[PDB]
């Protein structure tokens, strides 16, 4: 019966926790207490991009680290030119509620999600110099939360129906399907080699799926509240998480354990987005207290503070070459730091 089965499930959880204790040899701080502090970090707004009418919900950088795409709550995607602050396109939308955007590695397609359950995909370079909807993916229920590109013909989504699927633009059908979460899926991030990806659920848990096989590998549950953003270390063997409470942690794959916790006693707000740097030394993290913060990956101390949006930070990103840092906000403003 269920009582016998429920006993077996509890008879295995203790084994996981007991085995994890034996793997712990020393904390991260003990092995990294003999390095020089980075020091104060200060950088100013090099450029400001304006033209949106409502709050920005997401953004993504191009592969060449020159073009970027942003999505707003009035249903407009616009592709900026970072160097000269010149708009290139302005795409109207069928539905005015949009939560995500993406930019293909080859720079030929732009995909936007939304609450309309449709992961519509656009085309950039084509005849007549016009932009039209290429395909619409509608086999999925619940509002979407992220979209990513593996190549020109594969896109991964994640919605609030406790499901993540890998699509196929040409055929327009779900190739695989990942299940197992007990809450809404909020964000995901692809590995540097595009072989694995993770997903931050709403029940204070994070998994590690496999693109080919389609099964869950591990599960980390060190948090105590909602999870809002995830990003990978540039190495590909660790990932940082930004939760609803002020804590942002850093897990490991091989060690299968949580390593360091980033928090301060004077912060009681939420977390919106996180991102690393080129060398994986800094951990930028947005906040809900009208500005941003810069932590350290090893010393775990706040170095510098980025402020000036006058409204909550809703998205964040770092270019491929690590030359600039871009942030969005809810007051129709984008900024570039350096």
């Amino acid at each position: 019966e269920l009582d016998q089965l429920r006993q077996e499930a509890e008879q295995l959880k203790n084994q996981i926790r007991d085995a994890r204790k034996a793997c712990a040899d020393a904390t991260l701080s003990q092995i990294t207490n003999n390095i020089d502090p980075v020091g104060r970090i200060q950088m100013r707004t090099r450029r400001t991009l304006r033209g949106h009418l409502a709050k920005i919900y997401a953004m993504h950088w191009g592969t060449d680290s020159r073009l970027l795409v942003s999505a707003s709550q009035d249903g407009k995607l616009i592709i900026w030119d970072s160097y000269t602050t010149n708009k290139v396109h302005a795409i109207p939308l069928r539905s005015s509620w949009v939560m995500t955007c993406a930019y293909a590695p080859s720079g030929n397609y732009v995909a936007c999600g939304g609450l309309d359950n449709i992961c519509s995909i656009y085309n950039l370079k084509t005849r007549e110099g016009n932009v039209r909807v290429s395909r619409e993916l509608a086999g999925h229920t619940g509002y979407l939360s992220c979209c990513r590109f593996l190549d020109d013909n594969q896109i991964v989504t994640s919605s609030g129906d406790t499901t993540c699927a890998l699509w196929d633009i040409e055929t327009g059908q779900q190739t695989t399907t990942f299940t197992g979460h007990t809450g809404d899926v909020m964000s995901l991030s692809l590995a540097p080699d595009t072989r694995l990806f993770v997903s931050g659920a709403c029940d204070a848990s994070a998994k590690l799926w496999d693109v080919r096989e389609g099964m869950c590998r591990q599960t980390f549950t060190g948090h105590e509240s909602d999870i809002n953003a995830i990003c990978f270390f540039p190495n590909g063997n660790a990932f940082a998480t930004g939760s609803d409470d002020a804590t942002c942690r850093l897990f490991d794959l091989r060690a299968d354990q949580e390593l360091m916790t980033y928090s301060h006693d004077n912060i009681i707000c939420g977390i919106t987005s996180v991102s690393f740097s080129k060398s994986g030394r800094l951990l930028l993290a947005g906040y809900d207290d009208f500005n941003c913060n810069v932590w350290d990956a090893l010393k775990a101390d706040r170095a510098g503070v980025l402020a000036g949006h006058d409204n909550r930070v809703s998205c964040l990103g770092v270019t491929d070459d690590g030359m600039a840092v871009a942030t969005g906000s809810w007051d129709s403003f984008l900024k570039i730091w350096n």
């Binding site: 033209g51 009418l53 409502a54 709550q73 009035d74 616009i78 030119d81 000269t84 010149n86 708009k87 290139v88 396109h89 302005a90 539905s95 509620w97 609450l115 309309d116 359950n117 449709i118 229920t141 619940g142 509002y143 609030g160 809450g183 809404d184 709403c202």
Partner: protein
């Protein structure tokens, strides 16, 4: 080459001109959000508002009326074996097994054989006895209207009327939105209708709507939620109203309150049967407030019941920038909605918002 720079600047100028032109429309629109519990009547208002102010408001539609008729007749007959007290009726005994056989099938009984003997079951005395107590089992609210209209739908070329389209029930997946214009000004109203969720993490997106419309059923006080034996169907709405009202994001948003199914409530009180005091024990000591404005045709007995529901909802709002507007509506009556919205608009939410600097 400066030609590329000139072309890029020209494109930027064109895009800026288009954006400046489009900015005017966005600032001149009012956005409204519907809310409430399931099976309350949210989508009916959206469909009706199209007919009132837009000219455009069918073969595929005629399928779901037939679908509604099949579901209602199957539920009433098949649920009798599940009622604990026996009220068993021998007519159509060979047809009861037929209904059970067709109770589960992807393809409906399009053949005219099913329609012929289905009328007898509706006219059977046992079914009417079973229908008399519909609180125990879950039944569609449009059962009586369609069952009596079995003769019209049988003939070919049905061409259903607008009134018959309003009482149809079709589940909605995505955003149900409409865009109409009232005189010079224009409006934009959108449903949500995703699925029941205790968290509702998408409530952050609606942080700038002018008003939130709340719709609650008033004739369902002796039924349970779809999850059987959960709670009183009215008590599930009261809990939802309190959570929405006391939310961090919706801190400066007014709420318009609608109480639908007034005709259903009026009929329930008149013909005895279940009493409110059985389910709500505090109603026994209630006294009608002095500032009462009953409708001319309303009997004195039913006017005491209308204001008890309104008081329960209003007490939560007044306990804790915010305002609440009560109303009495009947979504089916086409002319009825055409007056409340107008009167509600009269005392504009906007005048109050502008009056904030000094009253």
């Amino acid at each position: 080459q400066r030609n590329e720079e000139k072309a890029q600047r020209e494109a930027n100028k064109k895009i800026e001109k288009q954006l400046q032109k489009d900015k005017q429309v966005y600032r001149a629109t009012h956005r409204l959000l519907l809310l409430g519990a399931g099976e309350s009547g949210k989508s009916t208002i959206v469909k009706q508002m199209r007919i009132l102010h837009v000219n455009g408001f069918k073969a595929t539609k005629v399928q779901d009326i037939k679908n509604n008729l099949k579901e209602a007749i199957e539920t009433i007959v098949a649920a009798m074996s599940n009622l604990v007290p026996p009220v068993e009726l021998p007519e159509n005994q060979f047809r009861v097994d037929y209904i059970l056989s067709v109770m589960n099938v992807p393809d409906f009984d399009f053949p005219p054989e099913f329609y012929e003997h289905a009328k007898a079951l509706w006219e059977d005395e046992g079914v009417r006895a079973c229908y008399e107590r519909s609180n125990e089992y879950q039944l569609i609210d449009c059962a009586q209207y369609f069952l009596d209209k079995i003769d019209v739908i049988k003939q070919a070329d049905y061409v259903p009327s607008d009134q018959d389209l309003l009482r149809c029930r079709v589940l909605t997946s995505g955003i149900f939105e409409t865009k109409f214009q009232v005189d010079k000004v224009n409006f934009h109203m959108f449903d949500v209708g995703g699925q029941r969720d205790e968290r509702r993490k998408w409530i952050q997106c609606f942080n700038d709507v002018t008003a939130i419309i709340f719709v609650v059923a008033s004739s369902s006080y002796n039924m349970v939620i779809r999850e059987d034996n959960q709670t009183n169907r009215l008590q599930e709405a009261l809990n939802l109203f309190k959570s929405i009202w006391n939310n961090r994001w919706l801190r400066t948003i007014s709420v318009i309150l609608f109480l639908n199914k007034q005709d259903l409530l009026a009929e329930k009180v008149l013909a005895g049967k279940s009493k409110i005091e059985d389910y709500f024990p505090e109603f026994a000591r209630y006294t009608t407030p002095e500032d009462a404005t009953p409708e001319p045709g309303e009997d004195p007995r039913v006017t005491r019941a209308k204001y008890f529901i309104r008081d329960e909802f209003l007490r939560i709002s007044t306990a804790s920038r915010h305002y609440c507007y009560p109303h009495f509506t009947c979504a089916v009556d086409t002319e009825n909605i055409r007056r409340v919205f107008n009167d509600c608009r009269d005392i504009i939410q906007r005048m109050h918002l502008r009056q904030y600097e000094l009253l």
